[PDB]
Amino acid sequence: EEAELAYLLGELAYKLGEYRIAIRAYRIALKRDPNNAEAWYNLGNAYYKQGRYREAIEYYQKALELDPNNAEAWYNLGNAYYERGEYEEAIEYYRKALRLDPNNADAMQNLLNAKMREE
Amino acid sequence: EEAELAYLLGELAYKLGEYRIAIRAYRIALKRDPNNAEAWYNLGNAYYKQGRYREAIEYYQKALELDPNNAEAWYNLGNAYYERGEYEEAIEYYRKALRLDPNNADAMQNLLNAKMREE
Amino acid sequence: EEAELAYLLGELAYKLGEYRIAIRAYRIALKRDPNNAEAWYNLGNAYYKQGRYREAIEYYQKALELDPNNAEAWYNLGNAYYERGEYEEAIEYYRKALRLDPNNADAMQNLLNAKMREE
Amino acid sequence: KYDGSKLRIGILHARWNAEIILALVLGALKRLQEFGVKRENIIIETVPGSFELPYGSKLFVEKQKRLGKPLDAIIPIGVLIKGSTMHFEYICDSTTHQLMKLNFELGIPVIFGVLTCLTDEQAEARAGLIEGKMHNHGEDWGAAAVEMATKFN
Amino acid sequence: KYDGSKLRIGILHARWNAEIILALVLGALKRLQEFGVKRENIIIETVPGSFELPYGSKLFVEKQKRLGKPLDAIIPIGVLIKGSTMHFEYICDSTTHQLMKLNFELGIPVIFGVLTCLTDEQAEARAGLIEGKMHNHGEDWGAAAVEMATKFN
Amino acid sequence: KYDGSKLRIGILHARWNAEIILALVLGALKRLQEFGVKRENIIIETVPGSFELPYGSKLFVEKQKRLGKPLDAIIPIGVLIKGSTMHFEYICDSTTHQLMKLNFELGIPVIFGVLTCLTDEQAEARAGLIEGKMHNHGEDWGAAAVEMATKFN
């Protein structure tokens, strides 16, 4: 209902690169329907895009609780942790993403370099 | 009310070339207000744009029931039928469009070539 | 609530340059929440952009009643008056904008030239 | 007495203390036009303040020259009011020296359109912003630019 | 309004009165970056104090130029506070004259990033070091450098 | 931080107010040597006083250059103490301007080794001649010469 319109509005804003709207529209949509994991992941992506990596994590973690098989999100979550310098957390999130999706070649190379840096 | 916002949202999505949203937003808006012929025509245009010509027809036909004087739609409907190879149906839809709007020069030439192909 | 979605929708339309939507979405949002001065200013900006300077004034004036410290709006209002040839009204609106915001260099030069023309 | 219709006169002015300055800038423009200076030949541009004007005026002239509109005369305009610091005394002085040097360096008259006041009432009176005191000096600056730019030719 | 992403702006600053200066130096840098100036294009170096800056700034520019990184604008920064001697008055003056001369001698705008205060509270307020007084003037210097360096091109 | 062993630094100094000056001259020399400046590369010569130093320093440099020992930096040293006449104010000013001009005219840093004090106690403290007040500023002048002469290369 209202959430769908709010998700469609935020979605359009995400596609267009406008995160102030993408964030508010999804928060509204989520208040109306809190179980939309995709929207929670996307919400995390908006914060992520803004450099708000801790916020991105909060939303990515919520989204994973709702649906933990989202390998892309596991990767994106690890990336938010890497941006914060949290290499140990971040490497586990990338490794989980690769285990869920073995074809994530980019995760392979990025987790490999991250591991070198993790120490 | 909600339909207006849903029509404005879909409309923006149509203009921006995003049909997943344009379609969902109009379907929502139409559930709230089923008599909006313009939205039904546009809904047909979204499906049409996606290559979903049979779906486009369904919505164009509904829209024509609501307002059958829309010459452009008569044309667009004939086009969906031509894409499906339905030349006989399609030629009538283009001819009706031209009768409603004699200045549709493009319909004249396209129905003329279509007639050659119809047999 | 609905107003927020309507404001987010109009806002996206303003950013994208589509005023038919920006105007309808804000009018809807304002019907739901009439005290949003920013939306009233923006509504005026949509009309302003369309060359509808008298309408722009109506909305700018409403917005100023709600929040008269908006120097940019005072300027924009004066501009709508200048476009209508209303130099005396317009010069006061630019001067007020400059008094509220002394750093509005553009208002300084534009009110200065406008004053020359005012007579 | 003088005909300014053939002259390009520029005004470069401070943004700060705008109430006084705008009265001064217009005062000069009105008179320049009374001497026949075409409004399109009066170039008005701004800088933040008084530190910019002493050299900003050269940069201004160089740009106008490159654009094919070299000035015949210039009136940098701005207002210095003494505060609690000594920036007033040092700016007043170096500004004056730059503006005097620029009378030869730019090849054109440079009019000291800068005020060196201790109070606001004094600067305001000099701009004719106060009905009961002084006159708008901007008018004299305007007239002077026309005379200096024609008198010595 | 202005885009500083293509500009090289240098800051040469005094070591003495660092608390005030560091606030001023950062104020300018933050704004320069807000105008798009890349952090790598902001060159920050120091000298002991105010006697060095009036010429130190030329030597600074010459080095940056030799290195292939000539500046588009410079803001020497420092703080003079009147003491019991008259070094303040003579430095304030000669510094100002050197900095004004350097607006032409270096080919670039030279921003007077030097304070000429009688007290510490005044210099501290000018740096925005005092929450309740003035603002960080360094920000204006930063903005001015961007405008002066682009405005007249 | 800096290595002055390759630099020729000259000191030209006033004879008048010798007690203060000799402390200042040595202060600078000791530090120059601490930075590695060889004692033979420190050239110390005198003139009567403060009127001679503002140009005397150029004449000094020209001679050292002709002799095959051009200086990399110079610190003219002298002491002005305000008396009953205004010679102090006019010397302080013109001296400062000459010394600033000479930073470019001589091709080398010129350090303002001149005091502009109102009392003797102030000049004496600046030389570190008073155990309980200030420090020997000559030391800073020495260090500055080394840095200015190396920093910008």
Author numbering:
A (entry chain B), B (entry chain B), C (entry chain B): 1 to 119
D (entry chain A), E (entry chain A), F (entry chain A): 1 to 153
Please share text taken word for word from the publication where this structure appeared.
We sought to develop a general computational method for de novo designing protein nanoparticles with geometries tailored to present antigens of interest, focusing specifically on the prefusion conformations of the trimeric viral glycoproteins HIV-1 Env (BG505 SOSIP), influenza hemagglutinin (H1 HA), and respiratory syncytial virus (RSV) F (DS-Cav1). In the first step, we de novo designed antigen-tailored trimers, featuring N termini geometrically matched to the C termini of the viral glycoproteins. In the second step, we generated tetrahedral, octahedral, and icosahedral two-component nanoparticles by designing secondary interfaces between a designed trimer (fusion component) and a de novo homo-oligomer (assembly component). This design approach yielded nanoparticles tailored to present 4, 8, or 20 copies of the viral glycoproteins in defined geometries.
Five designs comprising a panel of unique geometric configurations, T33_dn2, T33_dn5, T33_dn10, O43_dn18, and I53_dn5, ran as monodisperse particles of the predicted molecular mass by SEC-MALS and were further investigated by SAXS. The experimental solution scattering curves closely matched the scattering curves computed from the design models for all five designs (metrics in Table 1 and Figure 2—source data 1, bottom five designs). Due to its high valency and production yield, we selected the I53_dn5 nanoparticle to investigate the capacity of its two components to be separately produced and assembled in vitro. The two components of I53_dn5 were re-cloned, expressed, and separately purified (pentameric "I53_dn5A" with His6-tag and trimeric “I53_dn5B”). Nanoparticle assembly appeared to be complete within minutes after equimolar mixing. In order to obtain higher-resolution information, three designs, T33_dn10, O43_dn18, and I53_dn5, representing one nanoparticle from each targeted symmetry (T, O, I), were subjected to cryo-electron microscopy (cryo-EM). The final resolutions of the reconstructed maps for the T33_dn10, O43_dn18, and I53_dn5 nanoparticles were 3.9, 4.5, and 5.3 Å, respectively. Some structural heterogeneity was observed in the cryo-EM data, particularly in the case of I53_dn5. In 2D classification results we generated particle projection averages that range from spherical to ellipsoid shape, indicating some degree of flexibility. Backbone r.m.s.d. values estimated for the asymmetric unit (consisting of a single subunit of component A and component B) were 0.65, 0.98, and 1.3 Å for T33_dn10, O43_dn18, and I53_dn5, respectively.
